[PDB]
């Protein structure tokens, strides 16, 4: 299963496929793997439906809990810290999260986008290359973005590239689901800007999916 995130001028977009497998068997076609944990951040976990939720749910609680207690939200660094503590917490007890966020306190709003991923050992990492991907199709997704990223100029193209990357991942990896036109199921996405995190509507993604498909027929 693959999660993808990329920065565009003025935000980040993060998107994730809907498939989930138990070995070779397809055990899910509907799976939401990307969730909004707060006003300016969202997490994706390339894992079971339950892991992706149960994790975001917990993180979202921590973040808000802090805000209610202290009057203000954590700084972005703070947010990453608690995340990392939470991740190391579950590894001393392999669902590696991808965090996408927007730092309001950032001096420059164009590059306010943030992407943080976690390595095998629970160590965090900030992405300065502009994109990132985790999960079984992660390699194909990154290599596709490598070629397409030059074309990202706004949130809309950022969203297309993200969806194309997930298309390419599903194309070369069987554990990653592509757009099911028969059932009308597409990848989930989330967009973050100064305005804040927002779930991208199925409408637009299906619109985009089709156009990727037809662009290759």
């Amino acid at each position: 299963x693959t999660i993808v995130a990329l920065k565009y001028p003025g935000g980040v977009v993060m998107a994730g496929d809907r498939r989930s497998t138990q070995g070779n068997m397809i055990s899910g076609r509907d799976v939401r793997k990307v969730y909004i944990t707060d006003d300016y951040t969202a997490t994706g976990i390339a894992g079971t439906a339950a892991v992706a939720v149960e994790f975001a749910r917990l993180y979202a609680v921590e973040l808000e809990h802090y805000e209610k207690l202290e009057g203000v939200p954590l700084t972005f660094a703070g947010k990453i810290n608690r995340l990392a503590i939470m991740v190391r917490g579950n590894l001393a007890a392999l669902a590696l999260p991808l965090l996408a966020g927007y730092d309001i306190h950032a001096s420059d709003p164009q590059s306010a986008g943030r992407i943080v991923s976690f390595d095998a050992a629970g160590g965090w990492n900030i992405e300065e290359e502009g994109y990132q991907a985790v999960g079984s199709g992660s390699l194909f997704a990154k290599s596709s973005m490598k070629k397409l990223y030059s074309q990202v100029t706004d949130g809309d193209s950022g969203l297309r590239v993200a969806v194309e990357a997930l298309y390419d991942a599903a194309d070369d990896d069987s554990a990653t689901g592509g757009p099911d036109l028969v059932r009308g199921i597409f990848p989930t996405a989330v967009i973050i800007d100064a305005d804040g995190a927002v779930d991208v509507p199925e409408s637009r993604i299906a619109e985009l999916a089709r156009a990727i498909i037809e662009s290759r027929s």
Partner: protein
């Protein structure tokens, strides 16, 4: 006994010497207005999605309670559903806590709490307000609550000037009026028209516009 009475008197005196606070139900939701010179020390706070909290008295003490409440709420919400957290429930907890303190600790907490709940986004439900006092006694008024300082001049002021279902800006005036008996104010509402997080502070220009 006489000793218990003394403890109660001490708590009342401690409270009757603090700044006053008012919570009243309005059509939009519940409004909190408290006189507060400090810009960093707060008497009104969010507790859970649909429930807020305001207190009067000795800060270190009621703040401590605010934290424990948040602690408790956030925990129940995780261990059950988010809709398990209710004004009813939290007040109950505060009661048992203040009740314990008043009985078994060295000094009673010199505080007075108000826990307000508002209806969840979709539904319709009359706002609930609860007043918990230094001893664990818990009252539930239907229209407004007044705490700290000299309450009578303000409770009477509201009794007569209180229109239920006021607009926000209306209820705000009635409250500031009843308090008389502007950057010295802490204001915030439990807007019932918000989807999840009802608490919303009113500060700066917005508060001025409301004024």
């Amino acid at each position: 006994e006489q000793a218990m009475r003394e403890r109660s008197e001490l708590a009342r005196k401690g409270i009757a010497r603090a700044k006053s606070v008012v919570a009243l139900a309005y059509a939009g939701g519940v409004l909190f207005v408290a006189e507060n010179p400090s810009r960093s020390l707060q008497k009104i706070s969010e507790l859970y999605d649909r429930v807020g909290f305001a207190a009067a008295g000795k800060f270190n003490e009621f703040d401590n309670l605010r934290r424990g409440g948040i602690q408790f709420a956030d925990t129940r919400g995780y261990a059950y559903d988010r809709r398990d957290v209710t004004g009813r429930q939290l007040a109950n907890v505060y009661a048992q806590t203040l009740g314990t303190i008043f009985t078994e600790q060295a000094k009673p907490y010199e505080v007075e709490l108000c826990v307000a709940e508002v209806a969840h986004y979709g539904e319709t439900k009359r706002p609930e307000l609860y007043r918990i006092t230094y001893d664990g006694s818990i009252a539930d008024e239907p229209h407004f609550v007044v705490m700290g300082g000299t309450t009578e001049p303000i409770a009477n002021a509201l009794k007569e000037s209180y229109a239920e279902n006021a607009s926000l800006t209306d209820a705000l005036r009635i409250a500031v009026a009843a308090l008389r008996a502007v950057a010295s104010l802490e204001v915030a509402v439990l807007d019932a028209n918000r989807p999840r997080r009802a608490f919303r502070r009113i500060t700066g220009s917005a508060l001025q516009a409301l004024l």
